[PDB]
Amino acid sequence: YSTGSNVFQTRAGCLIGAEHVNNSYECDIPIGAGICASYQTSQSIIAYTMSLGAENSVAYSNNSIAIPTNFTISVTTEILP
């Protein structure tokens, strides 16, 4: 391919035209083997390892209960053929 300046290599194959990024974000355009390409900011295609989500550590303890104080009645759309 013409854009041979950055030629990343992954388990899916040879990814030409996108530069690898250490940082991990959510998946936008899945590639394979846990790598998803995306378009982010001076703009270029970035290929990176997927971030499964914000790692949240529940403050578990022997005698620690968390009880909500209010709620949010939220309605969600489910579409079925």
Binding site: A59, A66, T69, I73, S74, V75, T77
Partner: protein, 226 residues
């Protein structure tokens, strides 16, 4: 507050459906797949399939019946193969739609015809109601769900030692803000003083691990005193 939240949620659903173009992804995909199947089936006629031409009239004219028979037979084999492929793919897709619409029928039955304790079936969260909305070759559900919002974390104990006898909550859990112990329902912070009405005595202090000392107010004690 709940009425306003429900109205706002309905409005936000309308706005999200209006704005996002790929919201109706499943129905649009079904329609597109069927249209593509029909278009490919129609385009299959233009294929020669190894014959001299893809037009029956062009084969019949310009060629006499002896080899017109074999040319037409080759074309028939090709077109019948195309039609079998179309109907087999359509049987697959009809089975898939049958599964999806059996899921839709049971989702109707357990979500709008009644409340479902079946977790993460009628919308994410504790389920309250549902509303069917017709859509072209499909159905849309508005799963009204209850979602807790504002956590406050307290110190909890499995039981209470009132008079050497453990006390367990009838409904809810034991919490304390640091000084006083309260029993509260599990999904909402409604603290209320420990009382024999909301705690059932069962057993002894020593058997339970994690039991904390406290008093349990007796509602009948002031009535006796007065």
């Amino acid at each position: 507050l709940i009425a306003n939240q429900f109205n706002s949620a309905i409005g936000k659903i309308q706005d999200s459906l209006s704005s996002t173009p790929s919201a109706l992804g499943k129905l649009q995909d079904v329609v597109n797949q069927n249209a593509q199947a029909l278009n490919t089936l129609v385009k299959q006629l233009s294929s020669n399939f190894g014959a001299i031409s893809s037009v029956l009239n062009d084969i019949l004219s310009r060629l006499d019946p002896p080899e017109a028979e074999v040319q037409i037979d080759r074309l028939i084999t090709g077109r019948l193969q195309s039609l079998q492929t179309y109907v087999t793919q359509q049987l697959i897709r009809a089975a898939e739609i049958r599964a999806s619409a059996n899921l839709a029928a049971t989702k109707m039955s357990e979500c709008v015809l009644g409340q479902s304790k079946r977790v993460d079936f009628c919308g994410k969260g504790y389920h309250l109601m549902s509303f069917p909305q017709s859509a072209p070759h499909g159905v849309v559900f508005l799963h009204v769900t209850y979602v807790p919002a504002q956590e406050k974390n307290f110190t909890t104990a499995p039981a209470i030692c009132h008079d050497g006898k453990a006390h367990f909550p009838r409904e809810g859990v034991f919490v304390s803000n640091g000084t006083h112990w309260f029993v509260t329902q599990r999904n909402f912070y409604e603290p209320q003083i420990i009382t024999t009405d909301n705690t059932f005595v069962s057993g002894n202090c020593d058997v339970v691990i994690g039991i904390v000392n406290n008093t349990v107010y007796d509602p009948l004690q002031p009535e006796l005193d007065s």
